[PDB]
Design a protein around this ligand. Sequence first.
Ligand SMILES: *[C@@H]1O[C@H](CO)[C@@H](O[C@@H]2O[C@H](CO)[C@@H](O)[C@H](O)[C@H]2NC(C)=O)[C@H](O)[C@H]1NC(C)=O
Lengths: 259, 36, 15
Amino acid sequence: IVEGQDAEVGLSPWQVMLFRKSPQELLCGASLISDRWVLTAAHCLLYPPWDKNFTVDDLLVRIGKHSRTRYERKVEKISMLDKIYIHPRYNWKENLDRDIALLKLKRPIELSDYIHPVCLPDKQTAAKLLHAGFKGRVTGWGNRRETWTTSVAEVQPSVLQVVNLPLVERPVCKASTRIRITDNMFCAGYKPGEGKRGDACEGDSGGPFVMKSPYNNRWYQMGIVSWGEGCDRDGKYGFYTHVFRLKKWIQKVIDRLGS
Amino acid sequence: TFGAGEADCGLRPLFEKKQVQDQTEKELFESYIEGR
Amino acid sequence: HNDGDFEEIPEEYLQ
Ligand SMILES: *[C@@H]1O[C@H](CO)[C@@H](O[C@@H]2O[C@H](CO)[C@@H](O)[C@H](O)[C@H]2NC(C)=O)[C@H](O)[C@H]1NC(C)=O
């Protein structure tokens, strides 16, 4: 993350990092919504352009981690996936639309002080909280400065990175790019004439854009880091998958319904 | 148990459940404008 | 997305 502070120990118990088995590298960030379901961005698994198409045999889920590389023997829980559900009408070629995915764990994890899930939006919270101007916290171990042929010169961060970015009016997100923006993705970031910087970069993708409810006092995942046009570029904002606008598909896939 | 996460989500063990706020928390509420 | 080596993990994940 570009222009952020260091996350506190336990500041985000729902963070997950899609680790690659071999070679062992950080693919993306993820989010825990149940003891056996993990939410990510559909491009972290399926992206024909970058020849991306992982199997369940490719992935390894790391939960409760606060170091980038360090195997936290006593606090991080590693798990393995079972199935991988990618949205059917995912637009990986015209605008990365419906960029959301769900991974089922082959084992409900032992929830600790560090492994503790996020809440999904309810009609009221989506309505009350999701207002242009309202800030949303985004976490992730990705790039601290936009890089093409990437890697360390202190670009990647040691521990979790946090940054709170305000939401942008839709007409401004649309008039920010040339890509067909739908109502299945919103954008966030400080305007050029604004007094602050920051943004999600490469490696943070998949990660949760959360918001703390003021009426209720719990956290709500309002989006998932989908894509941006360069990290922290004046006049360009970060796009996130609208979690609430795609919630039905989450219910329809998890089947955690009426009771 | 306390629940299977059911409606205990979002409630951070090292914070919300421990009455302790985080360093950048206030920034959020300050932005929603509507105070209590 | 690239590599600045990552520390050891219990290999019954790898095999
Ligand atoms: C590459 O990704 C495709 C999906 O685009 C995988 O296809 C699977 O196909 C079966 C049969 O229709 C489905 O039941 C699975 O759900 C699909 N997988 C996913 C992740 O959606 C395909 O298996 C992948 N192949 C490789 C080599 O990774």
